[PDB]
């Protein structure tokens, strides 16, 4: 029993973290086999911040412009290239702690763990969702750039996120591991702002299912709803539209609890319209949207507390 | 910017998790140098689990009946003993992944990270507090016993918790690394129940300092309170009484911000009496109590671990 925002264990990623320095800018890098990945903005000067041309900045560097360190030990750079918004630095040693890994580009509403690092050393781990608008509501300070977001399936690390920047509202923006930004952002200091965001409806339903599996039913009701009528209400409360595919994803949680998806939507509709009347669900006073159906199935018993 | 509940990076602990099996019972052990620590109730049988005589049962256990697996490696048990509610199993291989470590007994209200584990395989990591009622609000399923809680101080892991059991309200109970329970609980199946709990005032104050450090201060006012007046109010709201010792523990945060603890208490008092009027503090609509004054510094200042 219990339910808490849980991260994947961070050890497989800890053994890949390095420091990368170019000029006097330093940030984190990710060292897999014989390559180090980091935000390309490591090469930006004091002014270059505003309008950098990265092709032009990079052609002016050699392999020895880059100081990569694993702890206090320097790894020599024997090649370099730019891939979208990342650098790929080849080094003359391989990382024997390299785990089995993939690179994946995740969809908004999906969750992942972030190992926050500074100067190539781990500070902490936390679990978050990519917002529907592609920003992350993270906890990052100056120098956290290059920390990575990931999930782990059995012993395989799926890297999904690299941190590049912070926006004026204090949310965070970054790239996948091919260097392409999540959301309509660029790596320069300009007037950029997070887009409109919505609540992740699929995840709020999943979490109401988690509360049932864990024994709680107070918020259910005797009603059903059509998918359409549910959206007509929920879209008034800034919720993401729910599609039939999202209904289908909830099938296994539905079967485990004996509550039909549209009956759970009818419950949600009521919570939205009436509020929680000072009650809690899984100890929360608000509706939580940072657990996917997959997270709920991984964390909760396969046996409902009836 | 942003504020998250952050766990310690878990890598140093993952390298210590093993699986321990006795007949049909499987749980987790902690492998440090040539000793494996685990809950003494691993020697119990599929149903022999209410009121066992552990001393009598251990009599009939030989070394060879303990099966200890580290990944796919078998670790041969060459010695065993009971220490309070733990077994210490001597094995023939000293753990090459042993970190610098200490065993410490955590005090009520202090936090730690939990590495949830099943079949000796780490599953997830989350942060919790030791509640004033001596339970933790964890997230644990059958097979999690022997999962451990810890803190890190530079390069040194302080182990402070080993999981033994779930209580009827779905909170959790366990021991320190000398096998002595936190609270009045026992490792048998009796009627035992969590006492009433209270909000950890020391941590609520710490987190309000963190809010101020982060620029969120709207709740500050020009007034002060006495400790006695503050406790009369806090006690109405089911908050732990604030002592002079807690006032001193908040000294560094108070010095950093120039806000005397009793001035922060006068802020807190108005919050409890009037609520937040729809405003947030560090993104929350509630007063968070699972961040210690020590957590606050580590998150605000980017402390790392080597």
Swiss-Prot record, chains A, B:
It is found in: Host cytoplasm; Host Golgi apparatus. The active site is at residues 41, 145. Residues 1-306 are cytoplasmic. Residues 1-306 form the Peptidase C30 domain. It comes from the Viruses. Coiled coil: none annotated. It catalyses: TSAVLQ-|-SGFRK-NH2 and SGVTFQ-|-GKFKK the two peptides corresponding to the two self-cleavage sites of the SARS 3C-like proteinase are the two most reactive peptide substrates. The enzyme exhibits a strong preference for substrates containing Gln at P1 position and Leu at P2 position. Exists as monomer and homodimer. Only the homodimer shows catalytic activity. Cleaves the C-terminus of replicase polyprotein at 11 sites. Recognizes substrates containing the core sequence [ILMVF]-Q-|-[SGACN]. Also able to bind an ADP-ribose-1''-phosphate (ADRP). May cleave host ATP6V1G1 thereby modifying host vacuoles intracellular pH. This is 3C-like proteinase nsp5. The lineage of its organism: Viruses, Riboviria, Orthornavirae, Pisuviricota, Pisoniviricetes. The chain holds residues 3241 to 3546 of 4382 of the full protein.
